[PDB]
Design a binder for this molecule. Structure first.
Ligand code: CTP
Length: 376
């Protein structure tokens, strides 16, 4: 609610210094759609060090690509010099970046017409490629020659799919046919960028339409384990967490986490998936189930099997929540047994823990001692 104002102030300051400056990218597209922008990018004739001269606080991490982050009025505004970029078939080499001297040299190499507009300080729209009419017709269309845009960055092919669902647009026919012809190029894209786009699709609207384009575009032929995305997505409803899309995909096909490990999940994400899948294969959940698994795993497993229980209340009403509340530890068992420390302690602590979680044995050291001396 303050980002557009701050971007306008940034533009005013750049122009006071004699430079050209415009709002570009998604913010123009969102403004024309009546949405509040997420991010507001500025394109300028200023070079990075000239931007830094004009603003007190700046972050420089993107300077090599022409970008300076300007910190103003509590917002961040990316300011990028007019530039073009090209990606090599080797995704180890940083992008080849070529500063250019005019706005339209920059705009004419962006991915889609609705993303290739600029807005002046006085709200005039610069639209050489017909983004306004594609926006009104709800069409995702590559700028210029679609083959060139997709050779410049193959991830754009998957971005088209993601935008279709995010905006409830269709993909321009000539553009879609170009994706089909170039879909093999997706193999050169870093898997982290692929996962980022797929995660967006999984939580965005009209995801079933996105997944149909994923197949129709022949991206599922060449994406890492891409055939696994061709499941029935009818009964998928996002919980806001993209991990649920991966879980859904795996559960629908009776597959395990190892089949999707090419996408380089965090250990935390991997655990949520694997533990949720275990729960879906567990025929009966009882107190020990609710104790040992996390509420988010219980909820995700329930969501994908179609159950609707009040999982939080069941877990909350166990006698204890976790091991740290147990009234006994291995050194109590060493004392009572007269035996030396060894792996046996873990076995006997778990026996006791189970009896406490089932509400059979009281979580009380002296009463546990009585039980242990009788049982051991
Ligand atoms: N692979 C890409 C990514 C970006 N763009 C250009 O860079 C702009 C900003 O990119 P991004 O930060 O990804 O913003 P959006 O296009 O709006 O994507 P999102 O809606 O997720 O923010 C895009 O609008 C487009 O003009 C591009 O041409 N090729």
């Amino acid at each position: 609610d303050d980002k557009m104002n701050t971007a306008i102030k940034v533009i005013h300051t750049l122009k006071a210094a004699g430079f050209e400056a415009y709002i570009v990218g998604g913010a123009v597209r969102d403004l024309l759609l009546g949405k509040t922008p997420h991010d507001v990018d500025v394109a300028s004739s200023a070079l990075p060090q000239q931007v830094k001269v004009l603003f007190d606080r700046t972050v420089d991490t993107g300077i090599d690509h022409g970008t300076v982050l300007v910190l103003l009025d509590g917002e961040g505004i990316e300011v990028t010099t007019f530039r073009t970029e090209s990606s090599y078939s080797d995704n180890r080499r940083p992008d080849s970046v070529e500063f250019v001297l005019s706005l339209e040299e920059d705009l004419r190499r962006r991915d889609f017409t609705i993303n290739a507009m600029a807005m002046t300080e006085d709200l005039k729209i610069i639209d050489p490629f017909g983004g306004k009419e594609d926006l009104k017709n709800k069409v995702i269309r590559a700028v210029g020659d679609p083959d060139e845009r997709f050779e410049e960055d193959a991830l754009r092919m998957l971005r088209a799919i993601r935008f279709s669902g995010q905006l409830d647009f269709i993909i321009d026919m000539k553009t879609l046919l170009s994706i089909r012809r170039h879909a093999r190029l997706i193999r050169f894209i870093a898997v982290e960028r692929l996962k980022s786009e797929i995660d967006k699709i999984f939580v965005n609207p009209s995801m079933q339409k996105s997944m149909a384009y994923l197949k129709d575009s022949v991206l599922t032929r060449f994406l890492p384990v891409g055939g696994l995305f061709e499941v029935d997505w009818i009964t998928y409803h996002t919980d806001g967490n993209p991990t649920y899309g991966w879980l859904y995909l795996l559960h629908q096909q009776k597959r395990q986490f190892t089949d999707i490990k090419d996408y380089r999940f965090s250990n935390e994400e991997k655990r949520l998936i694997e533990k949720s899948l275990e729960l879906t294969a567990l025929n009966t959940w009882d107190q020990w189930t609710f104790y040992k698994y996390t509420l988010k795993q219980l909820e995700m497993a329930s969501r994908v099997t179609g159950k609707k229980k009040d999982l939080a209340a069941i877990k909350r009403q166990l006698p204890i929540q976790s091991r740290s509340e147990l009234a006994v530890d291995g050194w109590d068992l060493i004392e009572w047994s007269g035996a030396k420390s060894g792996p046996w302690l873990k076995v006997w602590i778990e026996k006791i823990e189970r009896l406490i979680v089932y509400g059979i044995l009281k979580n009380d050291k002296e009463l546990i001692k009585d039980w242990f001396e009788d049982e051991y």
